[PDB]
C-alpha cells in the first residue's frame, strides 16, 4: 500500500525484496502487538472499583 499505492506492477517488483520489507513490517507489527500486550497486561478491571 505504502509504496505500490495499489499498483500491481510495483507489487510484483516489491515482492522480491519482501525479506527486507517483510522484516520491517514484521518488526513494527510484532512490536505493536508486544506493546499492546504490555498495556493490556497492565490493564485491570474491578467490579468493586467500578461503583
Q: How far is the CB of 40 from a copy of itself (least distance, A)?
A: 6
CB of 12 to a copy of itself, least distance (A): 10
- ∠ CA(7), CA(12), CA(13), 5° rounding? 100
The region that residue 6 occupies, defined by phi over 0 for left and psi between -120 and 50 for alpha, beta otherwise, is left
Helix/strand/coil for 17: coil
Chain residues 13-32 in contact with a copy of itself, contact rule CB under 8 A: 13-15, 17-25, 27-32
Residues making contact with a copy of itself (CB under 8 A): 1-3, 5-10, 13-15, 17-25, 27-51
Amino acid at each position: 500500500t505504502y509504496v505500490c499505492n495499489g499498483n500491481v506492477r510495483c507489487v510484483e517488483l516489491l515482492k522480491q525484496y519482501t525479506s527486507a520489507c517483510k522484516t520491517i513490517e514484521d518488526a513494527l507489527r510484532n512490536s505493536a502487538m508486544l506493546e499492546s500486550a504490555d498495556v493490556s497486561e497492565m490493564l485491570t478491571f474491578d467490579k468493586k472499583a467500578f461503583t
